[PDB]
Every structure is written in C-alpha cells, then in structure tokens.
Design a protein around this ligand. Structure first.
Ligand code: CL
Ligand code: CL
Ligand code: CL
Ligand code: CL
Ligand code: CL
Ligand code: CL
Ligand code: CL
Lengths: 384, 384, 384
C-alpha cells in the first residue's frame, strides 16, 4: 500500500517541526531518497518551514508548508527550475503585510519556482468593494493546516506530499485547497493534483494562476517559449513592441522591467496542452502540461531585466489573466464553485535535460498547433 | 488562602508554555478537575495558546491567552455555550491583518463563545480622521501580558484565571484590562470580574461589548430570547421584519444573514439585569447577568443562517451598540475614563440544564419586567 | 587575534537563541564583562530577542536583534541613556501593523534609546503615489538576518556587534544595512559604524534619522541642549513659542505634547560635530558625535510632557528632517545611493558622568561654534 506520516495537523494542534525519513529505513536499495522538514531561523524567516525531497540521480524538490506549499526550487540533471530573487529568505507570512505598498506587500516574499496565486481572488491589486484586493491572493502566504507525506510500499516508491491551505472567513468564504505534489524517485518530472473545495453553503467565486518561474540555466539570450496557441496579445501598451518576438527571450536587459502576454492556448483532442521554455541550444528546458477545462488561459511573463533585478520568465496557466479582479469579473473569467463542490487542477512539470527531450516537447507542440495560424493581436484585451 | 501560578509575565520575559495542574496532585478531595495550558500548532494557529479548566462533573471552560483571554467554549451538563464557526483554528493574531477587507480582518479569527469587543473602541468598522477603526477593537486579538491561575486552598476550591490585556501606544493611549474568570468546581455558572484601568495622565475614551455567542443545542427553531426591557428597535431596515417576533428564533435559514436589535434593558434595584437564550422545550439555556451601570445597553444578534454559514445568537451587553465609533460618539454612548481611574465589568454566565432552572430565570426576568410595557420602536436609532 | 560568534544567519537558517559568553571563559585580565542573548516571552514580546553587553564598572548596553538592532537602553556610572515609554514590551514586529492608525502603528512599539528611522524612507507618514509611507520606515521593525559578536583577545578587548537589517523587495528595492556597535570594556562611550549598501542594479532613494532618546536622570527642569549651529527653526507654528529657549528644557508639563526644532549644524576640520543633552547641575549628560557629510541635518525633539505620557528628548542626526517623504523629496534632502554603492554612518555616543566631562564637551563645542552667530528663524521650512 503506502506509509503516511502526518507532519502537521491543526485539528489536533500538532506539528512535528524538524523531521526526516530516508529510503534506508524503509529498506529499499533502488533510487535512494530522503524527505526532510526543516524549521528555519533568522530575519523574516523565523519559524518558516521547508520540506524537501532529495532523490539520488533525480530531482531535489523544495517546498514551503509555511508559504502555502509553494515550490521554492527544483534541481537535478545539471539544471533547475527556479530563479534568483533579491528576496533570499523564506519569509514567514507573519512578517508580510499584503496591504502594504498599496496591495503589493506580496513582493516582499516573492522568490519561488511556483506560487499558487489564488484562490479567493488573484491578479494585480485594486481597491474595489471598498477594500484592497491584494496582489495574487492569499494561498501563497497561508501556512498549511494539514501536511502529510506518503511513500508507496511498492516500486517505484512514488512520494505524495499533501498540504491543506485554508481560506476560511466568517461571513465571507470557506475555500480550502488540498494541494498535492507527486514524484517518482529518479524521474525528471513531478505533478501537481490540487483540489479546491467550497466548504460553505453558498456558491463562491474563485480564481487561480499557477505562477511558474524559470531563470538560468534555461533562460538566456535566445531561449525560446514554446506553446500551441490560437491567439496572443500584449497585456498593456508597453508589451506591444515585444509581440512579434513573443517566442524569443532577450538576455539580461537594463530598463526592460517586464513584458506580459495573454494567450488563448490550443489543446489536443483530450483537452491537454503543453507550454515550455528551452535554452538557445535546445538541450535544456522545462515543460508544463495542463488541462484547458481546468485552466483555460495562459500568461507569459517575460521579466528579462538584470540578473540582480530578476532575470526570469513566468509560464502561468490559470483561470484568469493577471488583471485585477474587477476586470476578470467584467470579462467573465472568474469561476464559481457550488456549495460542497470541488475543482481539480492537474499539472505535470518536466525538467528537460537533453536535446531529444526538448525535441519531443517541440514535436508535440507542433502537432497540437497543426495548421492553426497563431493570431497575434496588438490590442490589449483590457486596460487596468 | 490560595495558591497562585504565574503562567505568563512579560515584565520578567517568561511564559511557561505547556503546563498543567490537577486536583489529584494538589490533594483536593471533592470535585475533580485539572487546569491545562497548551501551545497549539498548525496553520494560522502556530504558537497560539489555550487554557482550559477541565471538570469531571461541572463545566469545562476553554479560553485563549493569545486571543485576549476570549472564551472559546463552555461545555457541561449535556449542553454547551458556543457555536461552530467556519474558522476552526485558534488564529494567532500575528496572522490577522485587522485593517484588511476594509476593517473586517477580525472575521478571519471569529469563532469564540465570548469576545471582548473593545476597549479603545468597538463596533462595525469606519474610516474617520484618516484612520481605519477596525471591527470590534483590539482586545480580542491582543496576547495577554500577564496570566495567573489561582486555586483556593480549601473547599469549595474556587479557581480564578486572570489575564492582563494591554492597549498601550505612545502618544495615544495606555488602557489595560485585568480580565478575570472565576469558577467553583462542580458549578453550572462562572463569572467575569474584569477591571479596565486608564494608566495614562489624560482622560481617554473607551467602549466595550461582551459579545456572547450561543449556538446548538440551545439555539434551535422555537428557542426564545428572554430579557426585561423598556424598548427594542431594529438595527437597520432589514431587521424591521423581525421586530414583532424578537423573542423567538427561527431554525437554520438560507439567505437570512442576520437581524440585530438594539435594546434598553430594565434592571432590579441593585442595577442588575438578566438575559437568556433557552431552547424550545425550556429545559436548556444560558443566562447572563450584568450590571446596567457598567453595561447600560444590550444588543441581540440573531444570526439564524445555515449551520455551516453560522447558526448562532449573540447576547451582547455593552457600553455601546454595534454601530461604528462615529455614530456611538455622535449619540453620546462613548464613555470616558479619567487619568488613573478604573471601570469594572461584573457578569455571571449560567448554563441552565433543566426546566426548573430555566423557569427560575424566566420568573426573575418577569419580576424585573413587572408592569412596564415593552416599546417595540420601528425606527432604527442610527444609520451607518 | 579575535573571536567571532555567529548568533543568527538566515542564509544558513540558524539562530542560537539563548546564548552567553563571559570574560572568565575568554581569560581577560583587568576588566570583567559578559555578552548574552535572551529570547523573551509574554504579551506582544513573544519570540523577541535582546542582546546585552554587561560591563562591570562600565556600560551595560542592551539592543534588540528582532527590532533592527535598535538600542533599548545604555546604563552605567549612576546614569543612563534611555527613557520610560508607556510601551513596556520589546514588541515583536509580527504584532505591529505599521499601516494602522493612518501610518502611526510604529507608535505601538516605540520605547527605545536609539531607533534607526530609515532606510528606504523616514519621517512622519503620508499617503503618496497610491501608497502609505509609514512613520519612520521599516529598519527599526525588521529582524536582523545576520548577527555576529566579535571580541578582541588582547587589551583593551574591544567588543563589536554586527547586525544585517535588510529592506529587500522584488521590483522595488534592495537596501541592506550592516549595522555595527563597538564598545571597549570599562569605557563611557560606544560607537556605531553602520554601512548601508544598495545591492540593486538601479539607483535608489534612501533616508535615515538616528533617533536617539534621553530621559531622566539627564532630562529635568533646566536641563540643557548643547550644539554648534548656524541656524535653528521650529517644525510648525506650535513650536514657535519655544524657539528663544531652544537650549533649555522645562519639567514634566501637562498639555505640552512636544516641540520639534530643525537645526543646521557646524563641524570641525574632519567634518565632525557634537550635540549633547546635559542636566541642570551640569554633572550628567550624553553626547553624540557624528559626521555632517553622512548626516547633514539635526532634529531636536523636546517631548517634555508628563512622566507617564513621555518625558523625553530626542537628539536626531540624519539625512532628513522628520517631515513626510513628499516634503523631503520636494526640498531636495532625499539621498540617492548608486548601484553597488555604500553609505557609512559613524557616530560616537558618550555617557558624561562628571562636571569636567560635561565641561570638555561644552568647550569642544565652543571651539566649533566660534564667532558664528546662531540664526533663529521663526518661519518653519515646511508645512505638512
Ligand atoms: Cl504520523
Ligand atoms: Cl471590458
Ligand atoms: Cl544532448
Ligand atoms: Cl509560579
Ligand atoms: Cl439600512
Ligand atoms: Cl428537566
Ligand atoms: Cl516605490
């Protein structure tokens, strides 16, 4: 079957803190691994936890239960999924005021490979309904209430890490997400299987962007963005000049800031699509597979500014674009979950570590693109 | 005589954390009990403390020193005082931003049987001056600075639990409340004897509502609210339809939200009054005794919505109604405390667990009411 | 040689918590001392740290690594640098919302002898752009990321305490200050040698006020403020009446609140200046040496209100006056720090404990003032 360890359970008032298991204790001499929770200290990181899967000749996956089960970084195969933010600390949400800087205090903690920007709302901040809707919602700055590590009894010893992140407020909402990361030791991919449940007796809105962020050694001058798309448009007027070269990345560029593109992806016959970033040579990359019934739109964030400012790209499948909640409501992208109902989010991330792997991804994308022409539309779909 | 244990003393920088005493080890020979402080973990409850008096044959009383000595739950005699909020965690105030949601962040922590909504201000939020007065003030989200447990050395072994909750701000205020709960082991009642003191050299405003909340098994369709009153009026236009049936509760009702009523209570010759919620059969209930010189007004919060949304009633004696501080100042209910002066708050809460007990409460209330007519006034006293 | 202890290093995820060293363990000859870090508990002080140098027959210096290495108090020679705020706790910044009270939340934590009011911004609050610039910035409410204690192994055994306080925000800033206090056992002075560094690739504004605060036994009726100045002016209309007796303090006075004065100091042949507060008899005082190229302006805060409200004076060298950032920008005092560049802050604090030490400071100040006339300007330089 499987062994489960409950690391954190708020209903029983318990948290194991520092903890580790390893493949020697389970008596398995195949692809060695360990799973470890560490309580961090110093600065604004005081009391933050990280949980890591260390796989011999596979991926090392670091996530933070304190920060909504956000993925900090993925390393392996001479590469990584991650970037180098000026924010070096794993910031305890107790030291972040999301309302500060007119709804941009979230920037004080942003350094992750994957942040769930949701679920009660998402996107750029706005003052509306008499309140501040803060940048990218609350999931990424909510400590998990339940954290469980499961390891399969039988080969290939799949690891599942679940974390329940709650957005429970009297008179407002009771949205809770059971996040799950799955990883087979030695594999070059992992998957997320997240389930958002509306525990209230009333329907409630939700939004989510799987904000996935990649820097060197995949991002570089001449790196490319690959996706099957029916249309692409600039987020704002500043991005218009980058529309023609949407598929190619510049090297680290002073005064660039960012250019964002809103994409309507194409999917295969079973609603699966794939997006990727690959290096100039075409021998390193990262791909994200997602289901367009769950996540119908895609944001491309090209943050090719200096290495210290942040040299990174975001491939961001979502229910929404990053416009503020007022625009996402007006344009009918905000979703609704019936009382007691659940929404699933299935994503597969692959660290592409040779030319053949990049070629296969590029071939699949071409097959989905087929003879459909990419419509490059210069007019932004909204103005904030 | 009595023995005192000092669980928390910020002046000496100490906090015992996990701690317990019990009647066995104390060689107490009559009603068995234990008193336990527990440090909680998980989710937004990380570091939060609860302090519980466990009784074999009496009341089990849980309070939270992290959350201003608010009373979380009272259980005994086949019943309870409390309710089931969507907020299941004992939220550490470090994870609440009271200014968020336009001064409604307090909703993210609300699950208690008794919240002190005060003392520097209280009531619904409003932006006045250039500042946000947040929902129900700060006492309830302030960790106690001094916590002591006292047990009398001989029968009946009265237990007292004291907690100093400070609202100290340079240039603004130095209001401090020494909260105190008293419980005789085996009893069906407990009392509060709080003392607010103005430690500043200037008079300062204060407001307080003892926001006392009762759900199932007391609250149900056909449950009744009992009180001796001179007048009652709806809080807003929406409550006008419920005024004629103010004394009777509906079952859990979808789309109800809440109806609030503002009451001017009658008192006996010693300025004591009594209010209660009783079930339909009249064999379970809870009564609150309060002093109308200390708490001159009463708010009835009828939140008979769905069980998941909140099926609960508040019996809320206060110096103020729940309108914002702007309305409470305008209508002259904001009290002032002179330099060095103190204000006392004496309340007795009784868990009524048979017909005779409910009948006795109903008879005392009928005696205080006497021949005074209840004025049901249709016009709200203020508009927010 | 020298011995170093790393008490806190966020990069490695470590913090020593409770820790001590003493001069018996280090085999020191003629002067006994200890350095101790203590983790505090209770109220809003839970988890806050203090770090103290105890020197027998010298100064006892207490600072807080949790609160940006702010100096809490200095004690020795029958006197002290410090004051008695109504805020008695060492408030963990997790429990302060700087945006509360319209940007005055900082007031809930203010009790320190020296607060670094900076560095991203400083001064009184203002809502500009779209954003709240909160009172006196963020350094004083930021836990240190790296904390090091260094002690020289031979006479006179100088102690150095370094604390890295970061203001790192994606897309906004990456200002980091390596604070440093130096102290020689047995001495009546200590020094600060801080270094602010812009770790970003873009120039950034900065401001700093070294908010140094003194009460009894130095401050009293007829206490004097000494400084070599070219001009002094009041902060606002209310401070006009105190302009002529700027050098003289009143006793604790009801309804005074405060009077603030904006000074232009003179300096010596190496750009050094000296400001001091001395008692009426002139046998106790405190002086601050600073570099006028580093901190070109000086603020005198006379808060001679009651002992309970706050009987304190601030000698406040800085790059800016306490006006909001809008005024400081407009009147051209906001400094710019270039990419990779550093700014230094060298200050010497001396606890004056006899008539001749006060004599010397007043005569050293005498030499600096010379034949230059003090221009008392009745017009405030700005209106907030
Ligand atoms: Cl377990
Ligand atoms: Cl539109
Ligand atoms: Cl290859
Ligand atoms: Cl004790
Ligand atoms: Cl209305
Ligand atoms: Cl009965
Ligand atoms: Cl800015």
């Amino acid at each position: 079957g499987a062994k489960t360890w409950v690391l954190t359970n708020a209903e029983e008032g318990i948290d194991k803190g520092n903890w580790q298991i390893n493949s020697d204790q389970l008596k398995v001499k195949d692809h060695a691994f360990s799973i470890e929770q560490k309580v961090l200290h110093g600065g604004k990181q005081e009391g933050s936890k990280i949980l890591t899967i260390h796989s011999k000749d596979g991926l090392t996956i670091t996530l933070s239960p304190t920060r909504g089960m956000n993925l900090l970084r993925i390393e392996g195969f001479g590469s990584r999924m991650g970037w180098d933010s000026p924010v070096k600390e794993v910031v305890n949400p107790a030291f972040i005021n999301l309302e500060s800087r007119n709804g941009l205090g979230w920037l004080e903690g942003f350094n992750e490979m994957m942040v769930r920007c949701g679920y009660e709302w998402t996107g750029h901040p706005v003052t509306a309904d008499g309140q501040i809707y803060t940048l990218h919602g609350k999931a990424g700055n909510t400590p998990a209430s339940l954290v469980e590590v499961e390891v399969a009894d039988s080969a290939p010893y799949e690891i599942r890490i679940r974390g329940l992140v709650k957005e429970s407020t009297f008179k407002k909402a009771d949205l809770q997400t059971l996040t799950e990361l799955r990883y087979v030791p030695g594999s070059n991919s992992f998957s997320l299987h997240d389930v958002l449940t509306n525990h209230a007796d009333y329907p409630h809105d939700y939004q989510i962007i799987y904000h996935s962020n990649f820097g060197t050694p995949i991002l570089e001058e001449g790196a490319r963005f690959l996706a099957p798309i029916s249309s692409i448009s600039p987020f704002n007027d500043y991005a218009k000049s980058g529309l023609k070269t949407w598929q190619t990345y510049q090297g680290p560029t002073k005064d660039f800031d960012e250019m964002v593109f809103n994409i309507q992806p194409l999917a295969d016959e079973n609603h699966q699509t794939l997006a990727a970033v690959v290096n100039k040579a075409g021998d390193k990359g990262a791909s994200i597979q997602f289901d367009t019934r769950q996540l119908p739109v895609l944001t491309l964030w090209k943050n090719t500014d200096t290495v210290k400012q942040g040299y990174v790209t975001g491939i961001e499948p979502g229910t929404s674009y990053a416009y503020p909640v007022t625009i996402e409501r007006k344009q009918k992208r905000v979703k609704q979950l019936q009382p007691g109902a659940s929404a699933q989010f299935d994503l597969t991330y692959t660290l592409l570590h040779d030319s053949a792997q990049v070629a296969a991804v590029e071939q699949k994308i071409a097959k989905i693109q087929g003879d459909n022409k990419v419509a490059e539309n210069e007019t932004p779909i909204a103005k904030e």
